[PDB]
Amino acid sequence: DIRPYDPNTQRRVVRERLQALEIINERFARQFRMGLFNLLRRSPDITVGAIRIQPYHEFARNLPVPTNLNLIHLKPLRGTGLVVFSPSLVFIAVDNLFGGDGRFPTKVEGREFTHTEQRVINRMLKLALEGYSDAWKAINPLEVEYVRSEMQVKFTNITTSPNDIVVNTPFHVEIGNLTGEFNICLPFSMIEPLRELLVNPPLENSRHEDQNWRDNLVRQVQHSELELVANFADIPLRLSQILKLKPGDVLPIEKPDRIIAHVDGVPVLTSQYGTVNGQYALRVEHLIN
Amino acid sequence: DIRPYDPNTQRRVVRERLQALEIINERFARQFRMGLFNLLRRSPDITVGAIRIQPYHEFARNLPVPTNLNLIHLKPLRGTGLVVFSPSLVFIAVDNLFGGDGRFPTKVEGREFTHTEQRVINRMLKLALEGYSDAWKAINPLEVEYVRSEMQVKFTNITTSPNDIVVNTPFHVEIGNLTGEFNICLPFSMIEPLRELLVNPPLENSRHEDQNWRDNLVRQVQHSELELVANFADIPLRLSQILKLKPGDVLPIEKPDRIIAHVDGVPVLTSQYGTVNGQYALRVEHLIN
Amino acid sequence: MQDIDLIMDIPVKLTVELGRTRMTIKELLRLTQGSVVALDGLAGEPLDILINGYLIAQGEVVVVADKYGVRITDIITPSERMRRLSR
Amino acid sequence: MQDIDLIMDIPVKLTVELGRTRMTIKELLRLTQGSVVALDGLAGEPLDILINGYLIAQGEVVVVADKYGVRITDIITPSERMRRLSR
Amino acid sequence: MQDIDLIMDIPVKLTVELGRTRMTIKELLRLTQGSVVALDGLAGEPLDILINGYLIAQGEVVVVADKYGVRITDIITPSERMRRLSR
Amino acid sequence: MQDIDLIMDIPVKLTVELGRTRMTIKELLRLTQGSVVALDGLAGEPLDILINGYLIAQGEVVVVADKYGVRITDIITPSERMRRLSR
Amino acid sequence: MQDIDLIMDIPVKLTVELGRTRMTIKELLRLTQGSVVALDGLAGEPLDILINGYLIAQGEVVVVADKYGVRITDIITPSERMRRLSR
Amino acid sequence: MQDIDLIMDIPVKLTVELGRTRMTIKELLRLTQGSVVALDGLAGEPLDILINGYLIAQGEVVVVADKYGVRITDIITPSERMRRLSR
């Protein structure tokens, strides 16, 4: 079990199934299929790839160079999302929009996209953004805002560290022999606050019923019990003195102006000691806030 | 008799015969037969299948993929009902509405329903909703409101748990060689408050007579007898002390500000002890409410 | 024994009952605030002492400086227990 | 020994506790400014002395010219420690 | 409110109980290693969920990849709570 | 002894606990219907058996023809009890 | 402000802690040369960053051409700080 | 001795420190997210082991199946301790 430590190594984090994310992906796939059929005048076939959890560098190394990378923001959540379009899909869209029948196989170029191809990518991106926004709306309100387009991981650093966990959902688009692919990548920290919503499958809306459920849960927990402990004061000493504790030994302590009340080590208020009803009393002054 | 426990196992719950539900199903079958004859211009044959009680997952696994699932709400009862239309019935309806004679056997497709087929399903659904509402009205006022249509168990979770008990009543529709089938599924918790109404067979209305019966039952029960016990106070102790109980032993108790009156362990009021007519008396202060 | 010591660490609950009586529900409904209800027990009789609802001894009411107390007097030996349960 | 001397150079922290009590969270919410809360310990009982949250001895409260002090009286020998922890 | 947020910082303890039963001490002494003890609850019934020994909800047992889990199903609303405490 | 026989007539209550865990109140508020909550105990570990809230033995879960049962396996002898309470 | 600039001229000391653990003195005496001691923290968790013994942020270990470095990742905002101190 | 056994029951806290460095507050303010900070210690040097903030030994970092560990190598005998404190 004992292994030597390497600072350049990292581990994985079990499994983080997001059924709600998959449902959103399927809804977005339906909307994007409709949009692509409307745009290209031909029926596409969109297949939702398996959701992938991997470090950011692992996702980056698999991206062909050059590739179209678009920065988006999922308001009100903080972060920057990425929409990845493969060059093959862009070439297919350009060929279809300019009357190409697709007979000629695509040639590897490795060149920057032209401004016309940039406009084609923007035309795809707007529809994709609308579709994804509509898909997300079914479970939680979100707004997607495109930021800028880049053609290299050089222009990235959406993430603080290359080893940060990100969520990538591939999609495969087929309009014939074409098997183009586009991907959506989101950092895990962006969707971390909504982890509970995304993990368990969604239920019926019943917002008033859910609020009543929360209110009842609050009311029932209010009758729970705990232990209240008040620390009079603290003393710095040494172990040798402790070995010599004897009857009559006097240890000086600092006089506490206020008595702090702690619950399992959690301060809750500051008070002053008193003698009421023949027992020690604490006059509450201020709550810890 | 002794068996090992498995958290992934569950048992059944005897039999829950609902004669009123069967009568409602028969009335709905009559109304839907009339509606289908009016719509398709041909006489259908609707057979009410045996009512089935099974966990939700068992019902889900038997549904062909894809299938038309419609979400309905039975107001004022809380929950979401489902109306299941088999693809064969939808195909038969589409063929009949567009002049098809039904000679050609249906081909397995496994594809999403078209918007025209969606409108056909909606046309069937409205009549089915009217019929079922009218059938339910005969025993208890209810309103059925369609929510949304889905084509997979992915878009379900009408139930909190897959093992929840649901009630499914199959129906078989025949307009020739066609033997199409549609099902109605309702969670048991939705109809749980009305269990008494649905179990025993209905009688004549006699609402005034029933109210008088309830009033007489209330009046007769008012003369029943019980035992009233008032607990003076309680003490926390240990068994060793109990083994040493001797004459003259004094046990300190906390002085009760109020005396709580309990009936078979059920508190009913809080009072204070007194001495009236040479016997102990309790001055009632507040009732437990 | 050692198991007596083991159960000694287990706390138990003691209950003191002033008295008992029987009446109809209609009479209880007739009762209002300030109503007077009598008890079967008389004045000066030892009160029942119950452990988890089981009577084990009897005592007399005393006050300790501000707190009520029970001065144990007698036990509920099986003959007396059977006699009082037969009632 | 020599390791006792080594750990002697290591400072430790001492904690004096006035008393302890148990109550529900609802009762705590009912408490306001100036509220009175009782403690299980009585008047004049020796207070617990804790080292890093572990009780090791007991003492009595004294004042030194302007500063509170604890006059150690007894120890928490294992029999008494087990008896008080069993509570 | 703000005090709800204040008590939110205070951790609490949750307890899940499989079932309960009653028996005499003599029967417990008769029990040995490998003995079988029954419970009042039946198979498939929701288990009680207790916060500091107070029942607040019920759930169903599930296993999470290697760890047991409770799938909350219903609540202990005052009518049901009074009914089950009356037992 | 005879007092063991006397207390034998006194019924007691037994409690079986599946497991325990600790969490903040905010996390509990975040929990909704169908939420999953983990427990400290692992799979296959003996469950705690409590008499009036005091742990006295451990057992394993069995089903008797329709009813859950606990098959007692081990005890909570003072060394193990102190070790598990120290946690 | 200007006093922030004044204290800027005052250097401070930063401390990075790999992890923490608790053990008895007897176990430490049992330890010899080459002994293996475990830590509470797991592999890959951010390490604590302390200023004069006070935790203010967390980071990840990196190596700079021959020298270890800490890549700051998160902060110790009061909710998380209270949660980790409660442990 | 017997008091060594008594203090053995008292748990203590162990602290492992990766390294230390000195810098101005202005430099700390200049630091942002992802900034790189160097340490005085070199690569492969044994890390300091502290008990309640007091250095007592040194060790080497190892990983145990998923958890970091410290493999103790040397001690902080008074000559070396004085030499390193003089720095």
Residue numbers in the entry:
A (entry chain O), B (entry chain U): 34 to 322
C (entry chain V), D (entry chain P), E (entry chain Q), F (entry chain R), G (entry chain c), H (entry chain d): 51 to 137
From the paper:
The bacterial flagellar motor is a huge bidirectional rotary nanomachine that drives rotation of the flagellum for bacterial motility. The cytoplasmic C ring of the flagellar motor functions as the switch complex for the rotational direction switching from counterclockwise to clockwise. The basal body is made up of the LP ring, MS ring, C ring, rod and export apparatus. Here, we present two high-resolution cryo-electron microscopy structures of the C ring-containing flagellar basal body–hook complex from Salmonella Typhimurium, which are in the default counterclockwise state and in a constitutively active CheY mutant-induced clockwise state, respectively.
Further local refinement on the four protomers using C34 symmetry-expanded particles improved the density map to a resolution of 4.0 Å. Each protomer is assembled by FliG, FliM and FliN with a stoichiometry of 1:1:3. FliG in the CCW-C ring consists of the domains FliGN, FliGM, FliGCN and FliGCC and adopts a twisted “V”-shaped architecture, which is distinct from the extended apo structure of FliG from A. aeolicus. FliM consists of three domains, FliMN, FliMM and FliMC, and adopts a lifting tong-like structure with FliMN and FliMC as arms. The protomer of the C ring has a “Y”-shaped architecture, and obliquely binds to the neighboring two protomers in a “S”-like manner, which generates extensive inter-protomer interactions within the C ring. The long linking loop LMC, which connects FliGM and FliGCN, binds into a cleft between α9 and loopα11–α12 of the FliGM–1 domain, close to the residues P169-A170-A171 (169PAA171), the deletion of which caused the CW-biased rotation of the motor, suggesting that the interactions play a key role in the rotational switching. The α15 helix of FliGCN and the following hinge loop LCC, which is formed by the conserved M233FLF236 motif, brace the FliGCC domain via hydrophobic interactions and stabilize its orientation in the upper region of the protomer. The αtorque (α20) helix of FliGCC, which interacts with the MotA subunits of a stator unit in torque transmission, lies on the top of the C ring. The stator-interacting charged residues, R281 and D288/D289, are located at the N- and C-terminus of αtorque, respectively. In the bottom subring, FliMC forms a heterodimer with the FliN1 subunit in a head-to-tail manner, while the FliN2 and FliN3 subunits form a homodimer in the same fashion.
